[PDB]
Amino acid sequence: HALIKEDLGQWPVETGISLVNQAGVFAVQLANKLGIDKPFVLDAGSNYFT
Amino acid sequence: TSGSIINHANNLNKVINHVFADKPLISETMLKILTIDGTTGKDGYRNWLD
Amino acid sequence: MDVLSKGSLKELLAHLEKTPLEEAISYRIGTVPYQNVLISRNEYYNQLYPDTTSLIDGVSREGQRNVNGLIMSIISYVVSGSGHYIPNIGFMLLRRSILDILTKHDTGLVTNNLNYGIIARNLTVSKMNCEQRKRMLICFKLLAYKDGNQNDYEIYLNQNIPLKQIAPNFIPGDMRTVIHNQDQLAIVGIPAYRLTQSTELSIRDDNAKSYKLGYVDWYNSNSFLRERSEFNLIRLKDRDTKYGKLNGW
Amino acid sequence: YRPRRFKEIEHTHGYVYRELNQGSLLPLVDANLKESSSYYFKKLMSSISNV
């Protein structure tokens, strides 16, 4: 048996309060992890071999 | 097969110097043409190879 | 020369807005439009070179006084750079812009009975090139929308398959269509190929090369306008802007 | 001002990152007309008086 797992981390969620407000806080941290918070242009063209 | 046009032309000029080392005039003359051609950039390098 | 250098629909339509109708009239007598003549081309032949004169030329020609002649002289100006001789037109018409003549009801000209097939034969369409034919179809479309004969424009296009394929796509009343057009309508311009000073055989070809070589001289003259080097010296009205709009539209 | 000459590469393959949106200054000015006007009048007058 084998499987492929995508690990985006663990984010605690508190009940009794609005979920969307907590999502916004975690959204900026998620963008920081993926490196997409600041304006960027992808250069992966040279990442190849023959 | 692989690499960029700028990399393609620059390494070819180094090989020309190695192959025709007994005749240094060949490397100098080809570099003169590329210096004029290479100001435009990648388009000029394509013009040099043409 | 200036009209033949317009590449985009926006530039051509803007030029027709500024240019008064008097530039379409020639004031020179010219000769009869359709006539078989013997001309001198000494660079190629010693014998005189036969040719047939036509309305689409860089020289003045005699034109009929009616509204048909006035429309034809406008089209000949756009596609060839020179108009026709229509005597004694009122000063009111001569001061109006070419676009106003083709797309406004204020002028007293009546164009409702215009036949597009007859005009296309008189301004010989089998002799025009692709860019010249595209310019003619622009003039026909402007007349159709002002007159309401948009169906007559479509029937004419359906009778000629090649014209329908190359017909410019725009709405004469919406500016957004004009901006989106990617058609190229430049008869004269900077030539990628090598252009020499030799003469040409046909009257149309020799006259066109005169405009082509003249534009190159005009390109390098001080009258030419260089945007990349003198953009701050231009008046705000004539400066290139994205929000530039034709009157109305 | 003298025009700037970019290189021929920058004209053909030049790209910039600009926001190109202008937010209105009215919300601050309308709410505080006295404070905003006094700030700009003082700043301008500190320079015109030095002519």
DSSP C128-160: --HHHHHHHHHHHHHHHHHHT-HHHHHHHHHH-
Tokens read off for C194: 């090598």
Mutant choice from B5, B6, B43, B47 vs D, greatest count of D C-beta within 10 A: B43
* Chain B residues 1-50 within an 8 A CB cutoff of chain A: 1-2
Which among C140, C85, C84 has a CA at the least distance from the CA of C115?
C140
**Residue in D closest to B43 by C-alpha:** D9
Model resolution, angstroms: 2.6
> In Å, how far from its chain's centre is CA A26?
9
Instruction: Provide, as residue numbers in chain D, all residues whose Cβ is less than 8 Å from the Cβ of B39.
Output: 8
Bridge partner list, C20 = C97
| Method underlying the structure | cryo-EM
CB C78 within 8 A of CB C151: no
> Which residue has tokens 């435009």?
B40
A48 shares contact with chain B (CB less than 8 Å) = yes
Bridge partner list, C39 = C49
Q: What does each C-alpha distance from C200 to A26, C36, C207, C208, C222 come to in angstroms?
A: 75, 18, 8, 9, 28
> Which residue has tokens 């937010």?
D23
Instruction: Provide, as residue numbers in chain B, all residues whose Cβ is less than 8 Å from the Cβ of D9.
Output: 40-41
CB C134 within 8 A of CB C168: yes
DSSP class of C85: B
Q: Is B39 exposed, middle or buried (0-12, 13-18, 19+ CB in 10 A)?
A: exposed
Bridge partner list, C62 = C85
What is d(CA C22, CA C15) in angstroms, rounded to the nearest whole number? 14
Q: Is C26 exposed, middle or buried (0-12, 13-18, 19+ CB in 10 A)?
A: buried
Which among C2, C3, C1, C6 has a CA at the least distance from the CA of C184?
C6
**How far does C229 lie from chain D, in Å, by closest CA?**
6
Instruction: Provide, as residue numbers in chain D, all residues whose Cβ is less than 8 Å from the Cβ of B5.
Output: none
CB C201 within 8 A of CB C43: no
* φ, ψ of residue C62 in degrees (nearest 5): -70, 130
Task: Count how many residues are written for chain D.
Answer: 51
Which among C73, C123, C125, C82 has a CA at the least distance from the CA of C101?
C73
**Residue in B closest to A46 by C-alpha:** B3
DSSP class of C2: T
Bridge partner list, C61 = C31
**Residue in B closest to D10 by C-alpha:** B40
Number of helices (H), then strands (E), in chain A? 1, 0
Using DSSP's 3-state secondary structure scheme, residue C36 falls into strand
Asked if B1 lies within 8 A of A48 by C-beta distance, the reply is: no
Q: Do chains A and C touch (3 or more CB pairs under 8 A)?
A: no
Which among C69, C31, C27 has a CA at the least distance from the CA of C203?
C31
Tokens read off for D6: 């970019």
HSE-CB for B47 with a 13 A CA cutoff: 12
Residues in D whose CB is inside 8 Å of some CB of B read: 8-9, 12-13
C52: Cβ contacts below 8 Å, ≥ 6 apart: C34, C35, C36, C37
Using DSSP's 3-state secondary structure scheme, residue C49 falls into strand
C161: Cβ contacts below 8 Å, ≥ 6 apart: none
